[PDB]
Each structure stands twice: as structure tokens, then as C-alpha cells.
Symmetry: C4
Subunit: 298 residues, 4 copies
């Protein structure tokens, strides 16, 4: 019932922009490594049956496409060092940009050494902390979110790039304010409009992705932003970039192809990127950064 | 065809608000007694068959949940002192906050002693006068509403707290103006959007609850306000509170569970409050009062 | 596909207005006689079979309700003095306010004496000229509308009150401008939203009644205005009055009851007026004139 | 899913404008010849089977109605001088205004002499260059659009009038900017809302005709503009003219009648023009130029 808000925007088509489709470059460095496109495979947990199966389809595809990939919560990896193989993905993705995952609420039960061990076990290149009071609140799970930001601030200068994200309910402007002084490497807005890790009566609460991207960019103008949350088409990707994002992330829609092998995942991402490439071209932008502003309301 | 208007508002979700769900306190003193939640069971008459049956289900639940309860018009109690047992509810609700009810149009046929007798017979803690020109007008009932406010003003300083309410068609800003100098204890906006005591072609007339809450708060900034009229979910409750209300009231939806015993009523209110609690938490509010303003348009 | 626009307005319900339904007076003098309500039976031609039958049902009802009545084009009466009995209605409506009708385009084929003869034959109290370039244009009929206003200006000071009206496509503000210096007795806005005498691909052209009432009132603030064109309910009547009208007129919906006798017509008008009376009461207005402004957008 | 935007506008009906339908003159000179109406038959290619068949139905009709006609891309005529008869239409349309067609992207493979030969072979009166990066991009065709405008600027002073057009995706204001200094004879906005030569997931990109007409007129106030792209009714034609256009063009809808002979095409255009004539009349405009501004929003 709640959309991303991107349908309330129009890409500014430029018939006489004078570009050559081949001129558009999607190359975009992120978190230390250089990506072939401003795309990330969203974080996903799912089941322990298909777990390892899915991660390897995504990772392999990611490696082929030169795209980044966020792993699901390594939470269990701390307590169950045996579910290590379920995530170990470097075997099929040796050079890809991998981002470890963990709930920010875990900072009260895990210290620096645990964080280092997690990304080291996974051979990850960065760590993303997800914060989801709403989800954990509705699930009567762990609802104490006090001092987490201050707890991260203490730790923050870490040996690898660190980022923060929501899980489909979005980050508001005052949320970006709370992150303003932290030396983060990036932020994933993860707004409402697509799927909610919580859903998978109160699920009307949340911030539309389009809205989140605008609010967060205003507060953190210089930080690299990841637009995710129902940003399912290359066209929507371009809109997100024009509103202020730097990277796009897709999770849910990738489940289907992930169960049918890397070839299918790779194809999905491929349609999305080629579609993104046409949009930037039609927009007069020669790269993701140039898409900024080339969008209007109504 | 006419909504409360609350769908035109968005709760401002705060992922990084830094609260613990357990930190949100719903305790709110009202009309002399202290409630466990800012909730009231709306006034209802219905039939003489189920009459006593329903009141006792509501009252008992109210007592268990620490919530307030408005009784239906005690009109008949004045003329028929035998329908006394139909309302006598203290038997099952000894400490709850009970609010006697009576049409403001009755002030022309009843004096001070009658008002005192009514709340004393009911062992009520306050008296609420409902004013419904539209309803009585459409029902060709008693349509003379002259001098009622002046009549109440004369009486007003009474031995117990007194309030005024509509019945599903709402109170406008100029209505709040007419109540401005009266020493009332509270006001129930009772707007359009849910059910109309009148309905239960002209029923398009009326003021949307969301609209009424805004208008009345502007005129009576310091007075405690009750938002009612299709405020059926905890989410809608939070929106009402953020727009300016202090208490929520639900009537109609409570009929079903009231006919199936207190256990069912209590469960309904329970879902509503726990749902309200999540919303305040998701909003960054630690209590009803803090919800104020944490809502935006569109 | 095009509405009156009145659905985009909300009557301002006044719970504490302090009126008595019996206090609202609909009496409104118009074109020389005093009406019991600000209502007129719209002009209608139809067929020559039911012609006389319908006029007598309307006229009789009009007489009973103290309402005005506009006759259909007396055009044929000029050329065919035998269709005199088809309109002769005084037999059943001796004191009612009757308004003769004639296309403004006829001023080029008829002079003063013809106009006097027409209203005298009909025993009418006034003459209304309808101007419908669109309708006659679509019907490839007589489309020369040059100098008609100047032609009426020359004649205008007539022995009886004269007015101008459209036929369901509305009068714009610049239209009111063209009528500004004429000594007219009243104007019927007759906008789009209900039925079009033309309809009974281009019928999207026209001005919504709500829109016409606003535009014309702005240009002719002091002149009495008749709101017509899909103003089918008492509620819509009140809205029209609050937007600036002084009288309401309904045509089409009256056909059905007119074929079933005066008793049915009279009943229809009766529901409409009693419904109008409730609305003014709910609005805080004690008469049609006081309804002005008691309406808001959205 | 994307409309022209013309539905968001209302023609300003003028009941008292004082015109005679016969007073409205559609005569409008364009590209050197004088048209009986501000109408052009849009450019269409289609198939090689019906090719010649369709062109002759359109051309013949154009000749009868005194309207202009744009031919499909003469691209093939350059390489295949045998498909000359497929376009040769003067046989049935000796005096009509014919406009040769060619993709602007061809300027990199064709020089002045080739352009002269093309219009001379076709016995055309002007040349229209269509620019469609989006279409060619989605069709993985020729996507290099660099230096085309500068290439045309060099050539531009040609022996005949030259114009530029899109193909159903529209020209933006910055597009008009890129054409600002070129000595063009006219511009065809060809916006989104009707059909896209490309369509015949990314086809949401583009500029609504209504929007394009406004943007382009603002940048090129003095240049004659052609509104096309789902401008299928005379009413829509009038709206386009009131927004700023000078000529209307319809392509797709003309296919059906073109396959059933000139008589059918001629009839279609005939309904459209007579419908356009009524609209200007209803609007108070005595010709296409006077329609300007006689339209409002909402
Ligand atoms: C099955 C499923 C599992 C998920 N697991 C995680 C997880 O472990 N960690 C995390 O930070 N987000 C997780 N998410 C959230 C996504 O990374 C992110 O919120 C995203 O915005 C939702 O997918 P998207 O909008 O394409 O649909 C999960 C989402 C889904 C649907
Ligand atoms: C069956 C029924 C009986 C009611 N009886 C009373 C009554 O005696 N006194 C009163 O002040 N309001 C009465 N109301 C009005 C409600 O207290 C109040 O207007 C409310 O806003 C309508 O319920 P709510 O919006 O949840 O649905 C009654 C409403 C219903 C549906
Ligand atoms: C069958 C029919 C006949 C009409 N005849 C006349 C007529 O003779 N003269 C006139 O001025 N208007 C005539 N009208 C127009 C109405 O008086 C007026 O335009 C009105 O706004 C249309 O009815 P209303 O909106 O309730 O539906 C006629 C309308 C209808 C439907
Ligand atoms: C079958 C078809 C063939 C077309 N061929 C050409 C062409 O050769 N050259 C051109 O410039 N435009 C061509 N167009 C585009 C139209 O001239 C123009 O874009 C128009 O706006 C689309 O038709 P309209 O909106 O009525 O529907 C073609 C369109 C269609 C549907």
C-alpha cells in the first residue's frame, strides 16, 4: 500500500543531449574496490537449507558482473562457528566487494575483536550494521536500542570501512543527523516501497525510499549513499541516482534467480544495468554521478 | 465516502531514535483518575435487550486494562429510574474512570439537581454532554439548540469534571470558540470518518476527525482532547495524538467483542494499545504527549 | 466525465451554532414575486406528446410548493399560435412565478412586440433568454451569435424582468463581463456537471457549475444568481448558495416525477428543500443568504 | 501509462463570445505553401507491402483537404533508388505540402548533395530530420548522437525549409535550447502520450506532449510549432494550440483509414477538423492563432 515514491518523479528525457550510448561509464569505486556498476546485491538470510546454495549463486554472479555483494547477518557466525561454510563465498568470488552484515543492536553483546573476527572469517572488505527498531519491535524481539550510536562512535575507527542501513522501513533525516559525526564509509537508506525484512497492521509505518534518499542526502551531502527498497528497475535506479543516491541495491527480486543458478542472477542484474545504462543515456548523463538532478516532480 | 483524514498523514518513523520499547509509558491521568493508557471506551446505547450485557463486558474490560469508559445517554435513567440496573456497572468496575452521558439539549428540561442525581446514581466520575444538531435534525427529533451553551455556562461549575462531545459528525473551530470560556475538563472531537450515531443523503456533512483535531487544538491549546470517530487502529491513534489529541476513544468496533464477553473486549483494546505502543516507539516518542508533531502530510 | 465541481467542497458543519431547525427561513423574493424557497423548476421542452402533460404537473407542483417555474422555449409559440395550450399553465398555477423562455439568437428574427406578445400569451412574469453557441454549433443549427448582446442592450428596458442563461455548458467570467452593463434582473449560470440540452466527443467543453458560480459572482456581485446544472441534492444546493448563488434550479431529474403527476414532482422538490433546510441548519445559516461562505475546499 | 497531459487542461468555453461558426478560418500558411487547416499527416513507414498503398491514400486525402503530409524516412531511398515508386506520391497529390523525412543521425553518412537529391526525387517541399536517441538506444541500433546538431548547423542554410522532430518521446526545453541558433523553419515536438515509433520497460521515459509544447514554446517563442503525439481529437488539437502550438500532426490513428482508401482517411481528418472548428468557435477564437491562452489548468 506504500510505494517508494519514485513513481512521483519523471526522468528528464533529452533527445538532443548529443551522447553516444557507448559513452556512458558505470564504473564506480566504492568501499575500497572499484565496481563495474553502482550496484550491490542486497543482504539476505532466508533459510539454512538453501542458505549456502543462494549465497554462491549471488557471489559468483557478482564476480562476473563486477558488482558488490552484501552478506546476510553474520550473527549466527559468532555463536555457531560451523555455519562458516554457509557464508564462505570467496571460493567462487575471489575479487568481488563483499560487505559483512550485523545488527547494530549487537554492539551491546559484541566488542571490537568480535567484529574483526567476523569480517576476517568471511574475508569481507567492509561491515554494514543494520538498525531496525520497528522490525524487532513488531517481532517482540530485542527492542532496546539505547546508546547504540554512541557505542558505534566509540568503536568506529575500525580497520575496514563501515556503513549503516535500515531494512525496508527507511532512514529519516533526523536519523541521518544521529549519524552525522560518525566516520562512516557509506549509508544504505533502505526505505519503504519494496519489501520489509519485517513483513517477510503496523507495516504502513516507514519512510518511502524516494523520501529517504532526499532527506538523508540533505543531511549527509558528501557521504556515499545506497538507494535500496523496491528500486527494482534500471529506470527506478536512475531516478534514485538523480534524487541523490550513488549506488543501488536490490535484494528480494534476486531470490528467484538465485535459486536457479548464477546464470539467472547474472542475467537479472544484466537487464537491470543495461536498462540503467539506457536511462542515463536518455537523460544526458555520461555516468551515475551526472544523473543528479535530471529528474522532476509530477 | 468520507474518511477521518488520518490517511493523509504519515507517522515519522525514527530508526535511530535510540529508545527501548520498554521505555514507552502510556500512563495518562484524565478527569481525576490515572489511566494506564490514553484510551476510553466510547459511549454506546444500542438495545434494551443486550444493554446491561454489553455495559458489563466493557466495564469489566476497562477495569482490567486500566482504561476509561463512557456510558450511553442516561436520559432514560432520569425518567425511568428502573433502567438503573442496566447501567449500574461499578459491581464489575469498582475503580475504573466512568463518564456519565447526556445530551446537551437536555439542559432545557433538566437542572442542577437532576445532573447531580444522574452521576450519583451511576456512581460516575464525570459527565459528558453530547451535542448533535445534525443527527437530531435528520431524525426530525428535537432540533432546538438555542441557548444551550449559555445554559451550560450558568451551571458549569459543578461538583465533578464536565466535558462536551459530538457523535461522529465532528466539532469545528468555531464550535471550539463557542466553548472557549467554559470551565470544561475536556472535549471529545468525535469527527466524521468512522460511524455516525445518526447513520446507525445528508450524511456527507460533518468534519473529518483529523480535521476536527487540528481545528479544536488550535482554539483550545491547553484543554485535554479526545480523538474519536473511526480512530480504529493503534497507528491511527498515534496519528491522532501527533495531530494534537491527548486521549483516544473507540465505540462501534467494540460492539462485536462486547457481545462475546469481557475477554474479547479486553483483547481488542489490548491489540490496539500494544499497536499504539509500537507506533510511539517507532516514532521516537516515550509517551502519548511526546507524539505531538511527529507526523507529516502526504 | 465532467462534474459540477461541488464535490470538491465541504459544507462547514456547525455542531454548536445554536439554531433551532424551525428558525431557518427559505422565503426568498425573486423577479417580482415572493417564493417560499429559492428554487426554480428548470426550463424543459421535450416532446409534443407529453408536452402539455408535463408542464401541468410541474406548474401545479410549483403552485403548491411556492416555487418558481421556467417554461421551455416559446419559440414555436411565435410561429405556431396553436401550440398555445401546450404551455398555457396558469389554469393550474394562477399565482406561481412563471418565466418565459427564448433563445437569445432569436433577437435577430424577433422584435419588441413579439417579446411582449410571448410573455403576455403565456401570462408569464419574466423572460429568460438562453444562449448556447456550443449546442447550436454541434447541432449544425444556427451558429451566428454576433451582436446578440448589443441587440438585447438596445431592447433591454422591457415591461418585465429579464434574465440570461446557458443550457448546461456554463457561463464564464468573461461571459459575465459581456453582460455587466445590461439591466438584467438575474442570471442563470447553467453549468456543466449535470445534463446538457445539447447531449440530450466535444461535450467535454464547458464550465463546471461550481466554477461558473464563482466566476460569475466575482463579476456580478450584486445581481441575483441562479445555480443550475447537476445541482441535484439539497446538500449540493447549499454548497451552490455558499459559493455565491441565490437560487437553485433543477431540470432533468424532474422529468421522471412529472410523468407521474404533480404529487410526485411535489414530493421530489419537497425532499430537496427539506434536505436543503437541514444543510443550512447544520451550517449555522438561518436562511439562503447566510449560507454564503460557509463552505471550504478539499 | 503516460498521457499527453492535455487532460489536465480545460478549454475556456465562451457562451457570449459573439462569433458565428462561419467566421472561424483555419487557413494557415506553413513551410512555403498555404494550408486549408493547421494539420499535417504524421510521418509513417510501416511495411513494404502496403507501403505504396498507404502513402497514396494519405497523399490523395491530403490533396483533397488542403492539408500537409510528412513522408516516412527516405533512408532506404538513398541506398535503394528502386523503392522510389513506393514514395512517389505527386501523381495523386500534385499541389499538397510534402515534407521529406530522414533521421538526424544520418548526417554522418550523408552530405548536402544527398539531401538535395532526396527531396528532389520525392518532389518534396521541405525536409524534416527526426532525432530519437531513446528509440535507437532501446533497439540497440545506432546510438552515436554526437555532433549531429553542429553537423546540421554547418549545412542548415539549405535550398528548402528544414525542421526537426522527435518520434513520440518528446523534445525538452534544453532540447529546444540546442536548436535555438539554427535557422530552422519549424519544430515538431512529438511527445509522449500517443504512440512511440519505438514501442511499435523503459518506455515510461519521455516528455508528455502538453509538457513539451509548453517547454519548447518558452525557448522558441517565434518559431512555428507542430504538436503531435496522441493529439487525436479536434478538442485536443485546440488545447495544443492554446498551449502554444501552431500546427497539429496525427500519425498512428490514420493507419486504419489509410488501408481503406483515401475516402476513409479524408473522412477521419474531416471529423477532426470540423471538431477543431467547433472548439475554436466555443473558445471565442476566430482562427488557430487566437486559440493561444484560452485554456486553464485542472
Ligand atoms: C529474506 C530477506 C532476508 C534479509 N536478511 C537481511 C539480513 O540478514 N541483514 C540485513 O541487514 N538486511 C536483510 N534484509 C533486508 C534487505 O537487505 C534490505 O532491507 C532491502 O531493502 C529489502 O530488499 P529490497 O528492497 O530489494 O527488496 C533481508 C530481506 C529479506 C527479504
Ligand atoms: C449504537 C451507538 C450508540 C451510541 N450512543 C451514544 C450515546 O448514548 N451517547 C453519546 O454521546 N454518543 C453515542 N454514540 C456516539 C459515539 O460515542 C461516538 O460518536 C463515536 O465517535 C462513534 O463511534 P466511533 O467513531 O468508534 O465509531 C453512539 C454510537 C453508536 C454507534
Ligand atoms: C429535455 C430538456 C429540454 C430543455 N429545454 C430547454 C428549453 O426550452 N430552454 C432552455 O433555456 N433550456 C432548456 N434546457 C436546459 C435546462 O433548462 C438547463 O440547461 C439545465 O441546466 C439542464 O438541467 P439541469 O442541470 O438539472 O439538469 C432543457 C434541458 C433538457 C434536458
Ligand atoms: C508505424 C509508424 C512508423 C513511423 N515512421 C516514422 C518515420 O519514418 N519517420 C519519423 O520521423 N517518424 C515516424 N514515426 C513517428 C511519427 O511520425 C510521430 O512520432 C508521431 O508522434 C507518432 O504518431 P502520433 O502520436 O499520432 O501517434 C512513425 C510512427 C509509427 C507509429
Amino acid at each position: 500500500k506504500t510505494t517508494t515514491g519514485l513513481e512521483g518523479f519523471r526522468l528528464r528525457y533529452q533527445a538532443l543531449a548529443g551522447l553516444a550510448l557507448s559513452e556512458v561509464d558505470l564504473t564506480t569505486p566504492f568501499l575500497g574496490k572499484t565496481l563495474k556498476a553502482p550496484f550491490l546485491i542486497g543482504a539476505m538470510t532466508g533459510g539454512e537449507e538453501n542458505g549456502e546454495r543462494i549465497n554462491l549463486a549471488l557471489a559468483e554472479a557478482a564476480e562476473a558482473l563486477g558488482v558488490g555483494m552484501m552478506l546476510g547477518s553474520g550473527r549466527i557466525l559468532l555463536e555457531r562457528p560451523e555455519a562458516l561454510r554457509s557464508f564462505r563465498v570467496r571460493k567462487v568470488a575471489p575479487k568481488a566487494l563483499l560487505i559483512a552484515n550485523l545488527g547494530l543492536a549487537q554492539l551491546r553483546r559484541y566488542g571490537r575483536d568480535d567484529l574483526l573476527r567476523l569480517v576476517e572469517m568471511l574475508e569481507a572488505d567492509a561491515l554494514a550494521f543494520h538498525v531496525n527498531p520497528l522490525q524487532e519491535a513488531v517481532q517482540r524481539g530485542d527492542t532496546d536500542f539505547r546508546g547504540l550510536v554512541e557505542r558505534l562512535a566509540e568503536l568506529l575507527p575500525l580497520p575496514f570501512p563501515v556503513m549503516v542501513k535500515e531494512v525496508g522501513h527507511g532512514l529519516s533525516r533526523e536519523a541521518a543527523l544521529a549519524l552525522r559525526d560518525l566516520p562512516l564509509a557509506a549509508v544504505d537508506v533502505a526505505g519503504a516501497g519494496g519489501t520489509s525484512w519485517a513483513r517477510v497492521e503496523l507495516c504502513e509505518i516507514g519512510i518511502p525510499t524516494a523520501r529517504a534518499i532526499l532527506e538523508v542526502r540533505e543531511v549527509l551531502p558528501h557521504l556515499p549513499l545506497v538507494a535500496s527498497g523496491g528500486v527494482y528497475t534500471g529506470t527506478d535506479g536512475a531516478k534514485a541516482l538523480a534524487l541523490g543516491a550513488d549506488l543501488l541495491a536490490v535484494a528480494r527480486p534476486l531470490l528467484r534467480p538465485a535459486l536457479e543458478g548464477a546464470e539467472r542472477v547474472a542475467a537479472w542484474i544484466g537487464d537491470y544495468l543495461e536498462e540503467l545504462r539506457t536511462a542515463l543515456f536518455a537523460i544526458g548523463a555520461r555516468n551515475p554521478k551526472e544523473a543528479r538532478g535530471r529528474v522532476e516532480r509530477v
